Amino acid sequence: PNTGVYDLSGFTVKPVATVYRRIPNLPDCDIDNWLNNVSVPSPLNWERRI
Amino acid sequence: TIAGHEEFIQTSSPKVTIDCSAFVCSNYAACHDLLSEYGTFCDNINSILN
Numbered sequence: 001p002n003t004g005v006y007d008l009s010g011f012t013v014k015p016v017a018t019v020y021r022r023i024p025n026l027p028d029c030d031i032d033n034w035l036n037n038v039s040v041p042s043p044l045n046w047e048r049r050i
Numbered sequence: 051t052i053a054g055h056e057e058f059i060q061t062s063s064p065k066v067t068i069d070c071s072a073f074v075c076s077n078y079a080a081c082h083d084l085l086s087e088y089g090t091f092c093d094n095i096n097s098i099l100n
């Protein structure tokens with residue numbers, strides 16, 4: 001090839017470090033509070049939450 | 051007496067260069083694979099600006 005200045009291209013790929021803020025809604029139904037609830041049920045009064 | 055006034059004549063412009071593939075198909079590889087089948091388009095734009 002001839003003598004000259006050539007503009008050769010570069011390369012970079014960045015797949016690391018997704019940060020993902022996504023505006024959360026109403027947080028949870030809080031069964032991490034209900035399985036650990038202070039009122040512990042019995043088989044005679046077994047408790048159901050939908 | 052002697053009067054005086056000044057004038058401006060423009061002799062040049064800024065030299066703009068364009069990376070054609072990074073303008074069109076910035077970083078994504080599917081776009082580069084699609085742009086390869088257009089052939090001599092980016093090369094013609096680089097040649098005219100040169």
Ligand SMILES: *[C@@H]1O[C@H](CO)[C@@H](O[C@@H]2O[C@H](CO)[C@@H](O)[C@H](O)[C@H]2NC(C)=O)[C@H](O)[C@H]1NC(C)=O
Nearest residue numbers: 030031032033034035036037038039040041047
């Ligand atoms: C565990 O569950 C009980 C009920 O199952 C919760 O007790 C309620 O507390 C609120 C406010 O303190 C009262 O208004 C309700 O009347 C209570 N319920 C009953 C049946 O008395 C309790 O708050 C829960 N605790 C946790 C940590 O989740």
